[PDB]
Ligand binder design. Structure first.
Ligand code: HEM
Ligand SMILES: CCCCCC[C@](O)(Cn1ccnc1)c1ccc(Cl)cc1Cl
Length: 405
């Protein structure tokens, strides 16, 4: 379903990429998107899919656009437009200077000092989860670890009941990898129906949880509104539930297929951090965008006010001009260049948490289960969207090769 080309789009700049169902999805999601970086593709293309929008294909353009909030506004960050339109998450749907006050608050909740405080639980849960899987010689990494691990830590931070997971997770999935079962606004409202009562509760009777801190915070010397707390918490929920969850699956799928990379980490643990950066570059998984505030000429292409542009954070680090042999995983790269956590004023506040969760997982999994593989005859399926995912990850191992701690 292609939309008619607007008058201003040169036909030579058309490249019909469907961010929700790219073409060689079979090969892998990162590989499917990387088609955009072939020699045949211009730097800046127009797709008629998902209602028509621009796509910046190169790290340099992605970064510039990200830096430039004057022209490229976060007002409508999602494609298709209805979704970008229905989303009013804070601080994501705002531009500086306004953004800064809200960010400062969100940072209170997810920041460095919080991860530091939470470190023992992260370690505790990882170890417990892994130890529990170990003797089985088989899981569903996606349902068995990648989900519960980050999720339960989030629930703990937010002080929300684990009983809510399935319901929340569904709503979250609808948002980043829409299915057709809902609509963007409908999904948004259901999450909002959830959040409202809880927030109200925490304004009256505060806790020490993230929601209590957000519901009761100060922004530009005055107290946040209920609507504003609702809107921040909505973001926090999606970040906590959807991201880390998908990332670990790509990383695990990779490790399951590359014995040599496993070994490297086993013998030279001093590389973990470096490896974690490399995997964040290679298995980058987020793609959102911006809205043009005005007619603007960008790298010779004429952009019209109100045009949306996809600035795929995923793409930067896959760009050959940025990383030699981009598709190759090399833990000893001199410089791992990516924008996996964004760029500009919208830089991921949750990056510290996410890094801690990854590093713990690698160290702890490899410690106990050094030797594993993908289950024979399993067909791993990736899914594309605002956040990309793995459908299921069936792993197998010989319990006799594991190590209890
Ligand atoms: C591997 C994991 C993650 C990745 C790749 C990731 C990626 C991103 C990206 C690309 C952005 C910027 C979007 C834009 O510019 O429109 C963003 C922002 C954000 N992230 Fe993350 N994120 C992850 C995990 C998390 C976690 C665990 C949380 C905390 C719940 C979270 C919270 C945030 C928030 C609050 C912002 C908005 C900052 C602002 O607008 O000032 N993220 N993230
Ligand atoms: C629609 C406005 C806010 C978007 C919701 C947050 C998130 O979906 C997940 N997330 C949140 C923090 N980290 C991951 C995301 C994913 C990718 C990109 Cl590019 C932006 C956003 Cl906001």
């Amino acid at each position: 379903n292609l939309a008619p080309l607007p008058p201003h789009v040169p036909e030579h700049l058309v490249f019909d990429f469907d961010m929700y169902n790219p073409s060689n999805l079979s090969a892998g999601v990162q590989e499917a998107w990387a088609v955009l970086q072939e020699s045949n593709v211009p730097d800046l293309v127009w797709t008629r899919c998902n209602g028509g929008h621009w796509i910046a294909t190169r790290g340099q353009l992605i970064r510039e656009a990200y830096e430039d909030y004057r022209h490229f506004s976060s007002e409508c960050p999602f494609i298709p437009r209805e979704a970008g339109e229905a989303y009013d998450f804070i601080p994501t749907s705002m531009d500086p200077p306004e953004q800064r006050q809200f960010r400062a608050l969100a940072n209170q909740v997810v920041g460095m000092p919080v991860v530091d405080k939470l470190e023992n639980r992260i370690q505790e849960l990882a170890c417990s989860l892994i130890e529990s899987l170990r003797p089985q010689g088989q899981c569903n990494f996606t349902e068995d670890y990648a989900e519960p691990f980050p999720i339960r830590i989030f629930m703990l931070l937010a002080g929300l009941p684990e009983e809510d997971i399935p319901h929340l997770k569904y709503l979250t999935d609808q948002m980043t990898r829409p299915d057709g079962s809902m609509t963007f606004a409908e999904a948004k409202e259901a999450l909002y129906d959830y959040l409202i009562p809880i927030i109200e509760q925490r304004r009256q009777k505060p806790g020490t949880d993230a929601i209590s801190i957000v519901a009761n915070g100060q922004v530009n010397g005055r107290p946040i509104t209920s609507d504003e707390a609702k809107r921040m918490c909505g973001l926090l929920l999606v970040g906590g539930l959807d991201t880390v969850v998908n990332f670990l699956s790509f990383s695990m799928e990779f490790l399951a297929k590359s014995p040599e990379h496993r070994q490297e980490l086993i013998e030279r643990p001093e590389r973990i951090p470096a490896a974690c950066e490399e995997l964040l570059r290679r298995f980058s998984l987020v793609a959102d965008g911006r809205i043009l505030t005005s007619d603007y000429e960008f790298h010779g292409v004429q952009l019209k006010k109100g045009d949306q542009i996809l600035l795929p954070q995923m793409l930067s680090g896959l760009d050959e001009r940025e990383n030699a042999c981009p598709m190759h995983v090399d833990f000893s790269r001199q410089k791992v260049s990516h924008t996996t956590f964004g760029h500009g004023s919208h830089l991921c506040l949750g990056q510290h948490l996410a890094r801690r969760e990854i590093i713990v997982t690698l160290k702890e999994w490899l410690t106990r289960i050094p030797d594993f593989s993908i289950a024979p005859g399993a067909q791993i399926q990736h899914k594309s969207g605002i956040v990309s995912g793995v459908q299921a990850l069936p792993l197998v191992w010989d319990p006799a090769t594991t190590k209890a701690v």
